[PDB]
Point group: C3
Chain length 75, copies 3
């Protein structure tokens, strides 16, 4: 929630944001969460994708990723 | 451990310091060590808590976490 | 790979640079890659070591590690 914590979450997102877009696809969400210490598996990742991929293009934004990590850490 | 290494250990601790208490409980220690690349399981984590939770309240400080990562890395 | 992505890869290498050399051994490569979200196993790590430990002393450099992570993140 703090600025220091938000930057660290941003570092994990920017590491696997290949095409310099503001998005990550399924595989990049898995390694990003694992880079933050969460051993997420395929059923959990697909559940998160379908919850946040509103336009249905296979990508989620950073603010989507920020809210995911917010739910995981604060709980 | 150098200043650069200690800062990185500090970043992993501050990420899972949920209430800014300067302390982490069992679950927060587990994900923090895994955030540093160590796949730790429940028996090892409980053994670390029992070693460093001297007050017996279910929390350890950063200097407890710093010493844990010191022996795991060095 | 942007300059900020290379800094994050450098942080993972420097965390397990135990003796302040420019090298990591088998075990230090395993945890360094796992610190970046890749849960690699023994056969893959030994495969990467054999490819990049050209001198054959059980160590690889940062530029070896940077190239490994470049291939992993860019599929
Ligand atoms: Ca992308
Ligand atoms: Ca990590
Ligand atoms: Ca706490
Ligand atoms: Ca205590
Ligand atoms: Ca070394
Ligand atoms: Cl999980
Ligand atoms: Cl002790």
């Amino acid at each position: 929630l703090s600025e220091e914590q938000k930057q660290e979450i941003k570092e994990a997102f920017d590491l696997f944001d290949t095409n310099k877009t503001g998005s990550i696809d399924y595989h990049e969400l898995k390694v990003a969460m694992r880079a933050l210490g969460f051993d997420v598996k395929k059923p959990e990742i697909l559940e998160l994708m379908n919850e946040y991929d509103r336009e249905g293009n296979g990508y989620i934004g950073f603010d989507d990723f920020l809210d995911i990590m917010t739910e995981k850490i604060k709980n």
